[PDB]
Design an enzyme around this catalytic site. Sequence first.
Site, PDB file in Angstrom:
ATOM      1  N   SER A 280       0.782  -1.271   0.000  1.00  0.00           N
ATOM      2  CA  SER A 280       0.000   0.000   0.000  1.00  0.00           C
ATOM      3  C   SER A 280       0.805   1.310   0.000  1.00  0.00           C
ATOM      4  O   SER A 280       0.247   2.393  -0.213  1.00  0.00           O
ATOM      5  CB  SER A 280      -1.000   0.042   1.156  1.00  0.00           C
ATOM      6  OG  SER A 280      -2.069  -0.882   0.983  1.00  0.00           O
TER       7      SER A 280
ATOM      8  N   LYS B 199       0.387   3.896  -2.731  1.00  0.00           N
ATOM      9  CA  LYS B 199      -0.716   4.876  -2.707  1.00  0.00           C
ATOM     10  C   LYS B 199      -0.223   6.320  -2.546  1.00  0.00           C
ATOM     11  O   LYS B 199      -0.820   7.256  -3.116  1.00  0.00           O
ATOM     12  CB  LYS B 199      -1.718   4.520  -1.597  1.00  0.00           C
ATOM     13  CG  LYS B 199      -2.444   3.194  -1.835  1.00  0.00           C
ATOM     14  CD  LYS B 199      -3.507   2.996  -0.742  1.00  0.00           C
ATOM     15  CE  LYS B 199      -4.481   1.839  -1.026  1.00  0.00           C
ATOM     16  NZ  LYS B 199      -4.142   0.598  -0.267  1.00  0.00           N
TER      17      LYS B 199
ATOM     18  N   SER C  46      -6.049   3.658   3.560  1.00  0.00           N
ATOM     19  CA  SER C  46      -5.525   2.601   2.678  1.00  0.00           C
ATOM     20  C   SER C  46      -6.642   1.905   1.890  1.00  0.00           C
ATOM     21  O   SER C  46      -6.569   0.706   1.601  1.00  0.00           O
ATOM     22  CB  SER C  46      -4.653   1.583   3.441  1.00  0.00           C
ATOM     23  OG  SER C  46      -3.630   1.098   2.579  1.00  0.00           O
TER      24      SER C  46
ATOM     25  N   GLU D 272      -4.775  -2.819  -6.729  1.00  0.00           N
ATOM     26  CA  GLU D 272      -5.005  -3.432  -5.410  1.00  0.00           C
ATOM     27  C   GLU D 272      -6.201  -4.388  -5.473  1.00  0.00           C
ATOM     28  O   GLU D 272      -7.171  -4.120  -6.183  1.00  0.00           O
ATOM     29  CB  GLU D 272      -5.321  -2.358  -4.372  1.00  0.00           C
ATOM     30  CG  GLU D 272      -4.192  -1.359  -4.050  1.00  0.00           C
ATOM     31  CD  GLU D 272      -3.200  -1.851  -3.005  1.00  0.00           C
ATOM     32  OE1 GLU D 272      -3.058  -3.085  -2.840  1.00  0.00           O
ATOM     33  OE2 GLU D 272      -2.543  -0.990  -2.365  1.00  0.00           O
TER      34      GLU D 272
ATOM     35  N   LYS E  98       2.842   6.694   5.181  1.00  0.00           N
ATOM     36  CA  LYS E  98       1.945   5.751   4.517  1.00  0.00           C
ATOM     37  C   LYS E  98       2.463   4.339   4.752  1.00  0.00           C
ATOM     38  O   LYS E  98       3.616   4.049   4.478  1.00  0.00           O
ATOM     39  CB  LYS E  98       1.846   6.030   3.008  1.00  0.00           C
ATOM     40  CG  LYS E  98       0.954   5.013   2.274  1.00  0.00           C
ATOM     41  CD  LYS E  98      -0.541   5.297   2.552  1.00  0.00           C
ATOM     42  CE  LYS E  98      -1.446   4.085   2.221  1.00  0.00           C
ATOM     43  NZ  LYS E  98      -1.387   3.021   3.293  1.00  0.00           N
TER      44      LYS E  98
ATOM     45  N   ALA F 264       1.146  -3.487   3.852  1.00  0.00           N
ATOM     46  CA  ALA F 264       1.287  -4.862   4.316  1.00  0.00           C
ATOM     47  C   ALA F 264       1.069  -5.766   3.102  1.00  0.00           C
ATOM     48  O   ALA F 264       0.172  -5.515   2.285  1.00  0.00           O
ATOM     49  CB  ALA F 264       0.251  -5.167   5.419  1.00  0.00           C
TER      50      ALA F 264
HETATM   51  C1  BIY Z   1      -1.909  -2.040   1.695  1.00  0.00           C
HETATM   52  O1  BIY Z   1      -0.789  -2.448   1.953  1.00  0.00           O
HETATM   53  C2  BIY Z   1      -3.064  -2.812   2.155  1.00  0.00           C
HETATM   54  C3  BIY Z   1      -4.275  -2.556   2.039  1.00  0.00           C
HETATM   55  N1  BIY Z   1      -5.462  -2.739   2.233  1.00  0.00           N
HETATM   56  C4  BIY Z   1      -5.578  -4.006   2.992  1.00  0.00           C
HETATM   57  C5  BIY Z   1      -5.770  -5.192   2.057  1.00  0.00           C
HETATM   58  O2  BIY Z   1      -6.397  -6.194   2.462  1.00  0.00           O
HETATM   59  O3  BIY Z   1      -5.316  -5.132   0.895  1.00  0.00           O
HETATM   60  C6  BIY Z   1      -4.366  -4.208   3.931  1.00  0.00           C
HETATM   61  C7  BIY Z   1      -4.375  -5.539   4.674  1.00  0.00           C
HETATM   62  C8  BIY Z   1      -4.384  -3.109   5.006  1.00  0.00           C
HETATM   63  S1  BIY Z   1      -2.832  -4.228   3.015  1.00  0.00           S
HETATM   64 CL    CL Z   2      -1.790  -0.221   4.580  1.00  0.00          CL
END
Ligand code: BIY
Ligand code: CL
Length: 255
Positions: free
Chosen positions: A39, A42, A97, A133, A201, A204
């Site tokens: 993330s 972003k 996020s 994403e 920012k 994960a």
């Molecule tokens: C970014 O790193 C992420 C974003 N949204 C969630 C997802 O499930 O994709 C997160 C687990 C927070 S990881």
């Molecule tokens: Cl995140």
Amino acid sequence: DDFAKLEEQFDAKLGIFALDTGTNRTVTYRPDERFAFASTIKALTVGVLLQQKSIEDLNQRITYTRDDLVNYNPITEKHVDTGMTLKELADASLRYSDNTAQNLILKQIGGPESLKKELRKIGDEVTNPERFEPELNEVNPGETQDTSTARALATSLQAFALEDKLPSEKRELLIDWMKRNTTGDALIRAGVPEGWEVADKTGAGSYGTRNDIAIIWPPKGDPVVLAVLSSRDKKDAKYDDKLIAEATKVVVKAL
Ligand SMILES: *C(=O)C1=CN[C@@H](C(=O)O)C(C)(C)S1
Ligand SMILES: [Cl-]
């Protein structure tokens, strides 16, 4: 070495790049090792959005459907029927996020390929965006797709937030959103002394990837730009936020 001991304690690989912009003092550890950016992308995505959009352009209402929603839509899922402005999408992407928000913004700047081209233009020859994403979060060992390095992520964040890649009012917008991030309380924020301001920012990803990139300001003087990246051996590994907090404390002591 303190970073090596952290890797041993948390059974994780660490990637660190920190620059004091006032002195050119750095703290580095595996600064050119690739990690899935997850993330954190972003932040750079909004950087490029701000290069291309005027402030009034950010008022444009973006309509989307239940079908546009992906796996993590804390704000976007509550506004399907009414839409959201680009500004509101940037807010949700950076501060929550929100994955759908990132995806919609990505489309506005021409998608991952266009994002990559715009990063190349500002001197980032490393960051390699290919996907939307959440698919981008999943990178296997050895792959460079959707990866970058601590050095490159820090440098690109620095470029948008601190340098003339954006005019001052747009730099201020980016910083304000990042200062008000909701997801990073246990990470860089938890490793800086009282009175330090943090604009971060988080990310994960697979293999227990846990990242935070930030600009941090001491009470007096110039900002520090910092990227703290991490990953682990097993695909389904859980991460521990404390690794990032503790790594940050090491960087703070060293500077
Ligand atoms: C970014 O790193 C992420 C974003 N949204 C969630 C997802 O499930 O994709 C997160 C687990 C927070 S990881
Ligand atoms: Cl995140």
